[PDB]
Paper text:
Proteins attached to the surface of group A and group B streptococcal human pathogens that contain tandemly arrayed Rib domains have been associated with invasive infections and proposed as potential vaccine candidates. Here, we study Rib domains from Rib, R28, and from a [name] from [name]. The structure, molecular dynamics simulations, and small angle X-ray scattering of a Rib domain pair suggest tandemly arrayed domains are likely to form an elongated rod on the bacterial cell surface, thus suggesting a possible mechanism of immune evasion mediated through domain number variation.
Thus, we solved the structure of “Rib Long” (RibL) (residues 1165 to 1268) and “Rib Standard” (RibS) (residues 1269 to 1329) at resolutions of 1.07 Å and 1.25 Å, respectively. RibS belongs to the “Rib” subfamily, giving a Cα rmsd value of 0.6 Å for superposition with both RibR and RibR28N, versus a Cα rmsd of 2.3 Å for RibL. As predicted, the Ig-fold D/E strands missing from RibR and R28N are also missing from RibS but are present in the RibL structure. Thus, RibL comprises a full Ig-like fold which likely represents the ancestral state of the Rib domain, and RibS is an example of evolutionarily recent domain atrophy from RibL; this is remarkable because there are very few cases where we have the structure of both atrophied and nonatrophied domains that are closely related in sequence.
Numbering used by the authors: 1269 to 1347
The structure:
Amino acid sequence: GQTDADKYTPEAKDITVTPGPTPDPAEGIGNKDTLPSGTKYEWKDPVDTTTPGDKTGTIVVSYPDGSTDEIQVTVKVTD
């Protein structure tokens, strides 16, 4: 009786951006090719990338069955 979250292991990928609005969360998973098609990506909470610095955020990976993983990443906002 397994869920998708029992089977798949998303990998964090740190990203770098210029100051700007919250980036595309798909950029924070480094092994999307390993995950089922129909897997969705969203930030748990929007990362504030409006100012420079190293931000911490979490990507919610939602599998086709509705189970989830939560993956923390660093977003390096440049000066």
